[PDB]
Amino acid sequence: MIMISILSLLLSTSVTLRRDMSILFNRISIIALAYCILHDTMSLSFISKGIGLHGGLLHITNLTQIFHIFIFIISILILQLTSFYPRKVWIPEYSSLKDIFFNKILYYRTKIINKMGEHMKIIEYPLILLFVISGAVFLISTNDLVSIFLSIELQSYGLYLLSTIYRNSELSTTGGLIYFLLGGLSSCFILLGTSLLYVNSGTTSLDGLYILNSISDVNSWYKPYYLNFSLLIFSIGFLFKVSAAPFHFWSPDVYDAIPTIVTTFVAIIAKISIFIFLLELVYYTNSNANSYLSEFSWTYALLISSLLSLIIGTVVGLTQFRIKRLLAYSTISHVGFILLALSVSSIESTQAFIFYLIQYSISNLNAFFILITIGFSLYGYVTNNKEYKSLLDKNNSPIQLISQLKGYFYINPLLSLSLAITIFSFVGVPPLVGFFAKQMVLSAALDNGYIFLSLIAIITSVIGAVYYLNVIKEIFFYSPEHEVNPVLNESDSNFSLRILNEKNVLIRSVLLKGRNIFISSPFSITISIITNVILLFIFMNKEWLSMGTILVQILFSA
Amino acid sequence: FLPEAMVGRSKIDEKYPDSDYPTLTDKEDPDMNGGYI
Amino acid sequence: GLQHYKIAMDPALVRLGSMISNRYKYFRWTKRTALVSFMYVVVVPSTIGYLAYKTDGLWDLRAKRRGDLISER
Amino acid sequence: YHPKDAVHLGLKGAAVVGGIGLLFAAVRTSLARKNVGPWAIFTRNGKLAATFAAVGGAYDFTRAAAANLREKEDWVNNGIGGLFAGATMGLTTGRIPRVLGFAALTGVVLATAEYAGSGLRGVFKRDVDEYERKEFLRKNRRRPIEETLAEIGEGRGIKPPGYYERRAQRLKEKYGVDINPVCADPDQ
Amino acid sequence: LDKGSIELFGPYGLERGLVKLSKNISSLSTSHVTTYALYILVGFILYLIYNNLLLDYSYLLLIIILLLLLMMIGE
Amino acid sequence: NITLILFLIGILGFVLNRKNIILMLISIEIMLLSITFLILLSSLNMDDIIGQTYAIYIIVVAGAESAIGLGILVAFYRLRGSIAIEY
Amino acid sequence: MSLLYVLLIIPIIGIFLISTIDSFYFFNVSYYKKIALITTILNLIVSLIIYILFDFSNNQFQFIQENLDLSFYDIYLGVDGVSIYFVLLTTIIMPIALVSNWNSITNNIKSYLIIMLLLETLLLAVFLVLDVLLFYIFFESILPPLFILIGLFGSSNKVRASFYIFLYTLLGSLFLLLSILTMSSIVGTTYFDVLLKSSFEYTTQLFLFFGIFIAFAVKTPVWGLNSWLLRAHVESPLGGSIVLAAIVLKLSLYGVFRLILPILPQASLNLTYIVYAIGAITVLYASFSTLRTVDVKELIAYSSVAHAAIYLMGVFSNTIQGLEGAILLGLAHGFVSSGLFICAGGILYDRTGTRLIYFFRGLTQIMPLFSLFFFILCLGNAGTPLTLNFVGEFMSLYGTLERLPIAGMLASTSIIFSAAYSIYMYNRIAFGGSVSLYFIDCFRDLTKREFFILFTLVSFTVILGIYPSFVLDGLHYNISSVVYGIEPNASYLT
Amino acid sequence: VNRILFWTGFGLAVRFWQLGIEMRPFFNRKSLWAYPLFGGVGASFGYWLQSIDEKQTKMLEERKQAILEKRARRAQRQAE
Numbered sequence A: 001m002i003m004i005s006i007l008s009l010l011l012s013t014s015v016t017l018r019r020d021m022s023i024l025f026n027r028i029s030i031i032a033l034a035y036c037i038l039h040d041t042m043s044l045s046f047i048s049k050g051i052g053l054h055g056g057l058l059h060i061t062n063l064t065q066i067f068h069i070f071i072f073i074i075s076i077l078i079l080q081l082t083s084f085y086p087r088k089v090w091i092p093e094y095s096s097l098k099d100i101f102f103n104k105i106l107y108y109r110t111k112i113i114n115k116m117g118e119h120m121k122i123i124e125y126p127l128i129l130l131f132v133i134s135g136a137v138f139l140i141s142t143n144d145l146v147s148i149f150l151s152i153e154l155q156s157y158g159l160y161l162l163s164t165i166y167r168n169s170e171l172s173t174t175g176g177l178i179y180f181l182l183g184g185l186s187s188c189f190i191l192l193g194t195s196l197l198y199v200n201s202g203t204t205s206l207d208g209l210y211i212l213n214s215i216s217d218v219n220s221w222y223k224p225y226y227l228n229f230s231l232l233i234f235s236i237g238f239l240f241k242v243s244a245a246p247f248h249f250w251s252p253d254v255y256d257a258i259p260t261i262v263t264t265f266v267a268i269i270a271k272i273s274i275f276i277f278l279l280e281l282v283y284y285t286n287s288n289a290n291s292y293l294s295e296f297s298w299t300y301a302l303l304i305s306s307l308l309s310l311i312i313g314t315v316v317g318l319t320q321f322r323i324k325r326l327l328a329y330s331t332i333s334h335v336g337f338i339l340l341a342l343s344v345s346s347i348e349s350t351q352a353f354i355f356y357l358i359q360y361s362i363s364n365l366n367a368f369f370i371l372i373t374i375g376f377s378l379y380g381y382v383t384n385n386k387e388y389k390s391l392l393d394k395n396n397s398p399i400q401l402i403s404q405l406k407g408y409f410y411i412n413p414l415l416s417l418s419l420a421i422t423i424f425s426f427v428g429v430p431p432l433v434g435f436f437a438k439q440m441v442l443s444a445a446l447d448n449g450y451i452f453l454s455l456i457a458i459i460t461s462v463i464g465a466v467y468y469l470n471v472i473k474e475i476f477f478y479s480p481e482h483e484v485n486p487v488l489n490e491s492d493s494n495f496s497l498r499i500l501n502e503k504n505v506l507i508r509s510v511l512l513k514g515r516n517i518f519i520s521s522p523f524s525i526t527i528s529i530i531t532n533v534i535l536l537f538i539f540m541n542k543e544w545l546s547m548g549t550i551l552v553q554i555l556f557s558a
Numbered sequence B: 001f002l003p004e005a006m007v008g009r010s011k012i013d014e015k016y017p018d019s020d021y022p023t024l025t026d027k028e029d030p031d032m033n034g035g036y037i
Numbered sequence C: 001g002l003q004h005y006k007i008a009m010d011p012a013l014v015r016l017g018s019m020i021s022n023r024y025k026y027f028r029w030t031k032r033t034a035l036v037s038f039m040y041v042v043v044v045p046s047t048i049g050y051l052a053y054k055t056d057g058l059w060d061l062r063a064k065r066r067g068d069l070i071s072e073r
Numbered sequence D: 001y002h003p004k005d006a007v008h009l010g011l012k013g014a015a016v017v018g019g020i021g022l023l024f025a026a027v028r029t030s031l032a033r034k035n036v037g038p039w040a041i042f043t044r045n046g047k048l049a050a051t052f053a054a055v056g057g058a059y060d061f062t063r064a065a066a067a068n069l070r071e072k073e074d075w076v077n078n079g080i081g082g083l084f085a086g087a088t089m090g091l092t093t094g095r096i097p098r099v100l101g102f103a104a105l106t107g108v109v110l111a112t113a114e115y116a117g118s119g120l121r122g123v124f125k126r127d128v129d130e131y132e133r134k135e136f137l138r139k140n141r142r143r144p145i146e147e148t149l150a151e152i153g154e155g156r157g158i159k160p161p162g163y164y165e166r167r168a169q170r171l172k173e174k175y176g177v178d179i180n181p182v183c184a185d186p187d188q
Numbered sequence E: 001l002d003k004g005s006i007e008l009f010g011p012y013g014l015e016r017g018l019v020k021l022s023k024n025i026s027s028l029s030t031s032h033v034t035t036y037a038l039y040i041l042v043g044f045i046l047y048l049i050y051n052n053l054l055l056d057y058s059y060l061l062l063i064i065i066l067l068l069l070l071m072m073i074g075e
Numbered sequence F: 001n002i003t004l005i006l007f008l009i010g011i012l013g014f015v016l017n018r019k020n021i022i023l024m025l026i027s028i029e030i031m032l033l034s035i036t037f038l039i040l041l042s043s044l045n046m047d048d049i050i051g052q053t054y055a056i057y058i059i060v061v062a063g064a065e066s067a068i069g070l071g072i073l074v075a076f077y078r079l080r081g082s083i084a085i086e087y
Numbered sequence G: 001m002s003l004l005y006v007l008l009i010i011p012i013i014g015i016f017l018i019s020t021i022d023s024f025y026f027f028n029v030s031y032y033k034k035i036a037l038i039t040t041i042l043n044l045i046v047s048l049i050i051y052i053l054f055d056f057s058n059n060q061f062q063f064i065q066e067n068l069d070l071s072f073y074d075i076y077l078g079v080d081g082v083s084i085y086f087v088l089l090t091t092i093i094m095p096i097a098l099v100s101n102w103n104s105i106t107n108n109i110k111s112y113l114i115i116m117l118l119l120e121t122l123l124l125a126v127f128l129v130l131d132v133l134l135f136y137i138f139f140e141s142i143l144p145p146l147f148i149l150i151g152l153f154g155s156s157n158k159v160r161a162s163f164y165i166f167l168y169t170l171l172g173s174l175f176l177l178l179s180i181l182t183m184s185s186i187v188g189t190t191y192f193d194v195l196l197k198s199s200f201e202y203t204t205q206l207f208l209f210f211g212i213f214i215a216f217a218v219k220t221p222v223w224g225l226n227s228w229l230l231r232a233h234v235e236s237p238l239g240g241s242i243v244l245a246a247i248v249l250k251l252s253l254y255g256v257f258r259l260i261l262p263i264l265p266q267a268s269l270n271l272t273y274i275v276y277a278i279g280a281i282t283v284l285y286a287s288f289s290t291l292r293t294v295d296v297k298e299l300i301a302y303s304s305v306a307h308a309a310i311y312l313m314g315v316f317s318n319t320i321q322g323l324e325g326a327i328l329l330g331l332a333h334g335f336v337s338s339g340l341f342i343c344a345g346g347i348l349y350d351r352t353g354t355r356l357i358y359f360f361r362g363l364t365q366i367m368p369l370f371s372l373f374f375f376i377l378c379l380g381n382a383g384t385p386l387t388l389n390f391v392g393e394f395m396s397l398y399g400t401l402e403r404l405p406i407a408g409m410l411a412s413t414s415i416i417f418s419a420a421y422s423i424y425m426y427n428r429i430a431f432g433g434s435v436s437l438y439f440i441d442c443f444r445d446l447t448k449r450e451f452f453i454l455f456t457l458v459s460f461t462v463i464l465g466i467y468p469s470f471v472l473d474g475l476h477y478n479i480s481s482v483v484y485g486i487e488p489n490a491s492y493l494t
Numbered sequence H: 001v002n003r004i005l006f007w008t009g010f011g012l013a014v015r016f017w018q019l020g021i022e023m024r025p026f027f028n029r030k031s032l033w034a035y036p037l038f039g040g041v042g043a044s045f046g047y048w049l050q051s052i053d054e055k056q057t058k059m060l061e062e063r064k065q066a067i068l069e070k071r072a073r074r075a076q077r078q079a080e
């Protein structure tokens, strides 16, 4: 269905050159991804560690189909950012069912809604996300070395093209260039790792490698040292692609340079697919008998990356003044928590990993959505600050400095409180959802003997909470340097809206000011639903955590 | 590849200057109070 | 906030109160400050704690009458 | 136990850690922005590699030396070695407060890692039934009286039946006085 | 003590110590692809040495504490 | 032993490069050639045609990254006017 | 629904009404402030209804609700004599805390009222929860509203003050979390009934102690870790200062009756000399440095450190008297510290804009009603008889002496040193000469608002001092459950 | 609590938060129909979580029965 959607959208996009048609190609992408959700929703009717499909080169698991659904939903939420205009005009006289469905409003919407903004003029933008999504849902379902390599490149190459898609931006072209070049060196490590597996085993199938590893685990001319060495190089490539320290220097630079709409997708989807694939590999490469094979476990690199990611992510973030560099480093310290639960392979840690991943992907989405909405809200605001006139690509990233959010509490209180609720979730403050995620990963590690690592995590959680609080101090502790545009409310500056019934007859004509312009409902409702999920989680936790208890019970079962 | 305004250490030194933390010496601050006479 | 009544704020006392507030920004590690810090934070608590351990459960006074000893241990 | 040649192990510690710092010095030479040439690794960045050998060698030598004196192998030795290793890191900067401070941080962490158990490698496996172990802990509600009196001891309000007769015996042995409380009733 | 060593061996000394450290590590990021590529190779080799030389895990922690305290010193 | 030597060469291309971003494109391709050549020589040693197939798909993906990479380099050059790093 | 859930919903309902009234009228701030005050009074009426029905000698949790549906995290509410008076203290303070700060806010008044109405729910919950992870959940949910209360309505050094409280309380409380997670792993739940049955191995207890005490030592707070309070309380608004001292400083005191006395007894016994050594030191140092403090509001904050140490040594006495005295001294501190903060932060700062004791002298001459109440609250801080503060100190000090005599002997020096600073502060502001010359114009005396909250707080302190059996009869049976020990002829009966 | 009630109020709370973010007037009469709609969507998502919970309960119950047959079959085979 994703492949039927790509080819169909591609054929329609190929025969058009109209940039006004981008709005509708993004809307059809949302509808296309909804059919993929309905097909994968029916593919959950069996209890199986896995079924090999298409010649054994693919597999389906309850975890694979659960996370194909999650990827499609996260993509649908991001796709809205290009499916609907950022701002709308609303009047109490056009607010009923009869008005919204049978009547119509006429007014000059071009400068109010930003109809011809850069994001609303890339025809192949909905198409290329679909290509990235395809490589993501293939990685999750790969049962062969070759399929892994081909899927990871399908995802990586499309992420490079997303970063370079704003061609008139000298910041986006640089970021994509940095990403392709450091991403290609990462691909060599993934390709070296799989190549060294096949040359020592004669097999490309993961299950044969799993059985070779299984028989070797017994407490002569062929000692299997290659599996833990090959998987170690194989882990370096994927560590880079999730930006785990020390292979992290690219993300703050690339996430800061590309447009904010783009970094929402780039900074979320790649980590969802890579972390799922690693979990199954960690499980079937485990040692059940402490022998010399267990002394060289590849999973140690993930334990050292987690330790390094916790420290770097929280310590380097202290002196960041650019908001996208800060959120990049905040993601690094969050994958240190994800990497710690992956490295402890226990029933409890695997459940904690599934929750940390889903809840954080959802919460880091709210942080990006709030940022994009705050930038689209300063349309009716003017600033004389000198540090803002010197900024670059102010349309691709309207909010680049944490200084720009000074006094937002005064400009928009609940938008400010939504960002407060999201940020405190990153810290781990109860009753917020982000606390329960870190709780489960501290309890899993403690029960398995990772006490030294748990103490290091709670220390860096205090250090990382410092730069989270600095963003809050800016929004609420100071008055705003942003002031309302004087012209938009001059008492002589009004725009005429006309109300028309079904047969284009003037019901009414209204005089509107900049006060009758608001945020579009697609962005306000999305922010509202996730902020509520972060806040009311302690009343709605049974089926979310029960799903993970069942998924891990099948994986460890027998 | 990126501007110095965005990744450079120089503008960190303006947001977080070393002057934010006093380092008065025994001659300047014998009472260890700020040079209060 | 609310307007307060008029106070003849003494510039000398205002700068003194400012001095007391920012004083920590100028603490250094000297031979003297270490000597006072080590005495107060280590020596006195360690001496009080040592006596607390040595005399713990040593005495009980309840119902003890003549012919009995206060010492438990 | 088997004694360890502290000097022989000390060289191994200096070379292993000093080798890594030599690799760090090499990155400095490669990243240098001027034509410093190849011999800049031993002239401009030599101090970086030298302090790595000094720190690593002192740690393993003092850890081994500590083990020989205490005749034991445990997390404590990782404390003595860490204190002397951190002390060596502070000697380079030449500041007294940091000689002690760096020794404090290094000693605490290197002992805390060992007493917790080696997290960075595969954790030790007891190889037992986890369900039996966890369930025993949850249902071990009462314990022998002797078991508790071993950790806390009688006294401090823990007067087990028979405390007074034992206290008499204890007090007689130590004070040499027989306990015989007075009547308080003129009659009987 | 209260306005002295308790704040120096505490929040104020952790503040001024960590801010100095974080500026130094943040100065390693020059947005040069050539220098970032060298870092990936360096971080690759350190993982290979650790999981092939069977080094004591404590040898790693000494490296991290050395490295962190080297960024604690300026210039 | 030839396959490991060429893998070093591509790696040392990154070791010895402060200015060429073109030479990082070249060093990535030398590394892909070494890995494909290793798979190809081990395939002849095990009588397995599937190694030849995996080599073919690595050549296709390798060309596709060359196209994606040189296209991004063209996008970067149009606005910068130099492919040189100011070191 | 239960009656303990009505306690929580009412402050939430008040938040909703403040948020929606503007949508029915541009509404006055006086209307927002009557909603918040009527809402806090209704919670106080419910809490007095609960206390009328409460059984003073029952070992089962009361006013519970049959959940019958189990999830990963579920709210379980109950009341025991150990917690009923903490709930009542929260419901008497919050109405006064609002009235005290009725004129002083001026800007962001809805936000201010919403945070206090939200704080009341979170602080009420922490006493009502019957699990130890749920205790932690609310014992730490108060940190985001308090960060923003200090930052929005605090004094000059507010930004640093709010960073100190959040980061110290976050750091200290994350060592408690590790200990709680370990107990849940070994037992399978943190519900009190199941956890209190379970007996841990001594070594587990000695490491669970290290981690609950580290949390409590930061939140008591002890002497070398009290920097956050010296900043938080002073730079906080008057209302936030009243809550933080009276109610938040008591969360660690009530947390020992749940997390330490019943489940880690052997560890508490063998480590009491470490607790008492710290408690003794923080009695002396805090008191010596309270004598030389030149900020009045920071002189009230330092006084709190010395009192918390007396009640901390009382909770570690293994005695019925020192345990009830610890709860009495925490209730007593709740009223008296509230009054002294109202005097310093709400009467002097309101009229002068200064907190420096240099500028105040002879205030009794022009403000005779302020000096009368100020004297009574200074005497209670000094533990004078006829105030509840004397009863708590005497029982807290006696159990300290009966446990380890020497430390209670140093701790008894609080009788000379609390008196020293309390009278010295008093003689320098109310007395000490004629009205200062730094006062250019005359200051008005107490308002009918300032008078009646000071009178209300003093009335609770004195009446409860005369007849402490109003609180003592409720705690007796429930306190009896946290004592560890046997007597040779009273135990193991056949 | 009741899931149908929590989800019905969750939809009510989402409508309230939406208008607060957009800084639009809560309670305009010609737009009051959104509250039944948001809450109605909330009620529907809940009948579905009720079906999810019903099935999860059955399968988590089965698993606990399986771990108990495994621990018992193994215990029986160790009696020899």
Ligand SMILES: CCCCCCCCCCCCO[C@@H]1O[C@H](CO)[C@@H](O[C@H]2O[C@H](CO)[C@@H](O)[C@H](O)[C@H]2O)[C@H](O)[C@H]1O
Residues within 6 Å of the ligand: A044, A045, A046, A047, A062, A540, A543, A544, A546, A547, A550, H052, H055, H056
């Ligand atoms: C907070 C977000 C909202 C809650 C999020 C979670 C809601 C959805 C959880 C679904 C997963 C658990 O719920 C259940 O799990 C098992 C796992 O194979 C699957 O169950 C499926 O296989 C079994 C076994 O053959 C069948 O009996 C069942 O009819 C079928 O649907 C389904 O997925 C779902 O019936």
Ligand SMILES: CCCCCCCCCCCCO[C@@H]1O[C@H](CO)[C@@H](O[C@H]2O[C@H](CO)[C@@H](O)[C@H](O)[C@H]2O)[C@H](O)[C@H]1O
Residues within 6 Å of the ligand: A318, A462, A463, A466, B015, B016, B017, B019, B020, B021, E011, E014, E015, E018, E019, G167, G171
């Ligand atoms: C226990 C582990 C966790 C805690 C670790 C502590 C790390 C603390 C890092 C704090 C980072 C911010 O710390 C602070 O930031 C603000 C930002 O204007 C600045 O604060 C500064 O403000 C003014 C300028 O406006 C300066 O003249 C003044 O000296 C200083 O207070 C300084 O840059 C820094 O003192």
Ligand SMILES: CCCCCCCCCCCCO[C@@H]1O[C@H](CO)[C@@H](O[C@H]2O[C@H](CO)[C@@H](O)[C@H](O)[C@H]2O)[C@H](O)[C@H]1O
Residues within 6 Å of the ligand: C059, C061, C069, C070, C071, D175, D177, G401, G405
């Ligand atoms: C109220 C707070 C303080 C209460 C707690 C402090 C109580 C102090 C009690 C001190 C006396 C304890 O009990 C006392 O111990 C001393 C030794 O030290 C002993 O004293 C004994 O000394 C000599 C031997 O040197 C004996 O021959 C003699 O019979 C007796 O006087 C006795 O055992 C007892 O007289």
Ligand SMILES: CCCCCCCCCCCCO[C@@H]1O[C@H](CO)[C@@H](O[C@H]2O[C@H](CO)[C@@H](O)[C@H](O)[C@H]2O)[C@H](O)[C@H]1O
Residues within 6 Å of the ligand: A470, A473, E010, E011, E012, E015, G159, G160, G163, G164, G167, G168, G171
């Ligand atoms: C046990 C050890 C300690 C445990 C953890 C406690 C750590 C507490 C560390 C907090 C450090 C202070 O945190 C930092 O303080 C400075 C003030 O100097 C603030 O800086 C702020 O105040 C200054 C005061 O001049 C103003 O210019 C401005 O409002 C702002 O810059 C920073 O916004 C804050 O981040």
Ligand SMILES: CCCCCCCCCCCCO[C@@H]1O[C@H](CO)[C@@H](O[C@H]2O[C@H](CO)[C@@H](O)[C@H](O)[C@H]2O)[C@H](O)[C@H]1O
Residues within 6 Å of the ligand: C029, C041, D097, D098, D101, E006, E008, E009, E010, E011, E013, E014, E016, E017, E018, E072, G224, G225
């Ligand atoms: C009762 C005490 C309770 C303490 C609880 C734990 C408190 C936190 C422990 C570590 C506190 C940090 O301790 C502090 O670290 C930094 C390291 O850069 C040092 O801070 C300072 O170092 C030297 C002074 O020696 C200065 O030149 C430098 O400008 C500054 O960074 C201090 O030497 C040290 O006092």
Ligand SMILES: CCCCCCCCCCCCO[C@@H]1O[C@H](CO)[C@@H](O[C@H]2O[C@H](CO)[C@@H](O)[C@H](O)[C@H]2O)[C@H](O)[C@H]1O
Residues within 6 Å of the ligand: A409, A410, A411, A413, A414, A417, A420, A421, A424, G019, G108, G110, G111, G112, G114, G115, G118, G144, G145, G148
């Ligand atoms: C987990 C996150 C942390 C939670 C901590 C608790 C925070 C509670 C904050 C209360 C809610 C926000 O409070 C909100 O403040 C803004 C201030 O701009 C008010 O908004 C209004 O304030 C005044 C009222 O005259 C107007 O001048 C201003 O123009 C307008 O924006 C809202 O009417 C109020 O509801």
Ligand SMILES: CCCCCCCCCCCCO[C@@H]1O[C@H](CO)[C@@H](O[C@H]2O[C@H](CO)[C@@H](O)[C@H](O)[C@H]2O)[C@H](O)[C@H]1O
Residues within 6 Å of the ligand: A446, A447, A448, A449, A451, D126, D133, G175, G178, G179, G182, G203, G204, G207, G208, G210, G211, G214
């Ligand atoms: C001054 C503060 C010093 C301590 C600060 C940090 C400590 C905070 C609480 C740590 C609790 C002690 O640590 C806890 O002890 C129990 C037993 O005692 C351990 O229980 C056990 O789990 C595994 C699995 O069976 C055992 O092999 C092992 O013997 C032991 O680690 C827990 O895994 C550990 O989490």
